[PDB]
Design a protein around this ligand. Structure first.
Ligand code: NAG
Ligand code: NAG
Lengths: 52, 438, 438
């Protein structure tokens, strides 16, 4: 039908092959919500969404 | 001379480095793998496919008795009967009543269409690796391919490259593996001679045009129950077809590390693991002595902005003052920072702009021009988009991955927790010694 | 009916055994390994032999200049010259005094005798054993050939024998191995691409009629001096004939455990090590009733003479009574004795002889006769001559190897010393805590 499937990429990559199409590579980059540059109520947010 | 360097094993992304001799100008050196094939050692056991149950014509002796002989064809089967009385389209084909004995017979061989969709079964031992390099030094590009074992010289146009042995030793191919029609499944087939009625390895032969076919397919016969002539046989279902229905996924969507499986030499080409410790023998013709390369008199780095990510996010600026209008090799001497441009034309005075890509929030790396060093230092922001379509160029390494203000706000706390107790202990022993005069 | 048995893997000598069932008569069973063939799974790597330096005719350009390209033949080597003036039989082959060049190229290929005189390098691993058997039970022989992995069955005329795994596994080969004219050596050759000039392996090819011939053999040209035209060169010694000088002994007279080593499939046939367990599915139609066999009482041995050698030197007699004639099996139920008759003829009240062998100087073993245990003791003596030409039958067992005289002197001495310290200890403790009263 007309569906949608979540997945989970890593640091090293993820490829998925939809049918007869060519495989497409996807990498993720460290985009934690915050900033590692001050106000210590907030440094422990950026270093928690990566490596909790 | 020869310069040792461990290039990482990721296909496509180059690993820049520069070499240094005394009295000679420095020379850049770009190393990149472009395609790497992984080929194992192949031992073939047999070939199986769908069978074809042949029944030769029923031998009938009128007014006598029979008993079999021995043969060697696959699943040879004898069962004489007693007191038969057959019937053709002309009724009463035989004459002598109540003791006619017929001889049934059954055996098997391959299907006629077995040449296309047979399933070769193999055995794999201790694969070896072959990488395709691409070396660019001093505007002289050299193509070559070499073996990865540390004694095999891959030579190409006066440039001897001895790739040493890789660290990790594995393959996606386990010990037993079948192959049909290009699709590489992965399966623990029965060893040769050991049939099973109703599973893979049901009918085995060392070649498809052979005559030493062996089989054990559980053919039990029946006594003929209707007046006409036939041969009532029953046989178990084919192990190849019922294996094919329950085959599972092939190796092309289960093999780790991104390996693409080519089938015709059974290779596992173009995937990424470990490091490749190589060494490049630079020829002595690409070296001009240091009196002729224009030396730079002072440099001072200053960066502009960062986005530490996969792509070339950070921008760089050196401000120099040089001697003449020649060239300069450019290399950053870190392991978390890599530069886009490798050489730049120089002026007696002028500026420059470079590009780097890093993964740490502080850019405290060292950038070398022709001869001198100048430390760059600023802080760098995380990226905005969560997913990018190209892989990272340097690693994470978890020492400089933590920020500077995080260390300056935690190491003060740990240093205070140590300082309060060492002050408490020294004033304890001082007070006890000062009262201890009595 | 299953019957587990661990026969010793040494060819030629049989292995006496009785099977037994309740309500039936027991019957003999002997299992000899008539032949065995230990074949490994191997992998061809390259064919090498003595090379042949071809030198094509030199190219001279009259009053000009030349340079060499890159070729791909086996060890191509070119370098130009200048200032020549070559002479043929009719001289003056150019027309300017020392302003011209000549070319000089050289390469190798195979000899026209390497189709008989080559040396096929291989790479063996994981040898898997095969055994030809000879089963005979109740004067009915059978010949079987089976694999000695614990799955693959061996079937011949309503008799199914499955051989268990090996006790301890080895193959007499190393990992790398080479072959020429049937003589299997044992060498660690340089692999494909890693040629050194002057050892075994400086010619590499897929097959001998292939084209991808790769080679390095230290061929360096020299400058000609004489006015006549030729090309001088120099080259290292052929490493194939240097290997052939001091190759060593072949492995047909260096392999342990004593086995003929065939070549054309690379067998390691017919040597003897360990024990292999089998289990024989005897058909129940080949049995006889216990209401049919001659039942006996009054069984007692009488030993004529004993000698512990590897022939059938010890003689032995029996006394019996029976109630009807026929055949009955004979068997010794020890591990230090075998018979040499497996069936005998029994009369009503008679008495017969036998022959045995032993490796123990104290023959205390239990013979059987038609299913009736009877112990009979004997005493033996060392042999006369001490080298024969037929292998031993029985191992040493470490406890029947010492005689009863050695044990009773030894343990009488130990019992004297132990009884002495125990009587001293008990007198010490009881007299102490009897005298200490007050
Ligand atoms: C190529 O390299 C040589 C040697 O360093 C240099 O002199 C030349 O300028 C380079 N070519 C270009 C186009 O810069
Ligand atoms: C073979 O054995 C059977 C019983 O085991 C016996 O009756 C027969 O006489 C034997 N054959 C010969 C030739 O003696």
């Amino acid at each position: 039908g007309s569906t949608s499937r979540n997945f989970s990429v890593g640091r090293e990559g993820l490829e998925y092959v939809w049918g007869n199409h060519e495989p497409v590579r996807v990498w993720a980059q460290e985009s934690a919500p915050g900033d590692p540059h001050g106000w210590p109520h907030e440094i422990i947010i950026h270093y928690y969404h990566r490596h909790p | 001379f020869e310069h040792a360097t461990t290039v990482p094993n990721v296909p496509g992304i180059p690993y820049k480095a520069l070499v240094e001799r005394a009295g000679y100008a420095p020379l850049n050196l770009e190393i990149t793998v472009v395609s790497s094939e992984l080929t194992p050692s192949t031992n073939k056991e047999y070939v199986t496919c769908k069978f074809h149950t042949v029944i030769p014509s029923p031998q009938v002796k009128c007014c006598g008795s029979l008993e079999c002989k021995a043969s060697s064809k696959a699943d040879y089967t004898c069962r004489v009967f007693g007191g038969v009385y057959p019937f053709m389209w002309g009724g009463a084909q035989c004459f002598c009543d109540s003791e006619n004995t017929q001889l049934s017979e059954a055996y098997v061989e391959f299907a006629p269409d077995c040449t296309i969709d047979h399933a070769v079964a193999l055995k794999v031992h201790t694969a070896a690796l072959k990488v395709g390099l691409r070396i660019v030094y001093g505007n002289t590009t050299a193509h070559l391919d070499t073996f990865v074992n540390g004694v095999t010289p891959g030579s190409s146009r006066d440039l001897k490259v001895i790739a040493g042995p890789i660290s990790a030793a594995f393959s996606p191919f386990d010990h037993k593996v079948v192959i049909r029609k290009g699709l590489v499944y992965n399966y623990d087939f029965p060893e040769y001679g050991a049939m099973k009625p109703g599973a893979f390895g049901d009918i085995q032969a060392s070649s498809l045009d052979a005559t030493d076919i062996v089989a054990r397919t559980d053919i039990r016969l029946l006594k003929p129950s209707v007046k006409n002539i036939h041969v009532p046989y029953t046989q178990a279902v084919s192990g190849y077809e019922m294996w094919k229905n329950n085959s599972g996924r092939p190796l092309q969507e289960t093999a780790p590390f991104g390996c693409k499986i080519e089938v015709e030499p059974l290779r596992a080409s173009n995937c990424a693991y470990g490091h490749i410790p190589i060494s490049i023998d630079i020829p002595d013709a690409a070296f001009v002595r240091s009196s002729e390369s224009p030396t730079i008199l002072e440099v001072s780095c200053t960066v502009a902005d960062c986005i530490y990510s996969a792509d070339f996010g950070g921008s760089l600026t050196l401000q120099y003052k040089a001697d003449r209008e020649g060239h300069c090799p450019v290399h950053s001497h870190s392991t978390t920072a890599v530069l886009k441009e490798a050489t730049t034309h120089v002026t007696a005075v002028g500026s420059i702009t470079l590009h780097f890509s890093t993964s740490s929030p502080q850019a405290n790396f060292i950038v070398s021009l022709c001869g001198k060093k100048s430390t760059c230092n600023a802080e760098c922001k995380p990226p905005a988009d969560h997913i990018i379509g190209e892989p990272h160029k340097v690693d994470q390494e978890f020492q400089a991955a933590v920020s500077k203000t995080s260390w300056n706000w935690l190491l003060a706390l740990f240093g205070g927790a140590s300082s309060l107790i060492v002050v408490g202990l020294i004033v304890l022993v001082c007070s006890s010694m000062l009262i201890n005069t009595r």
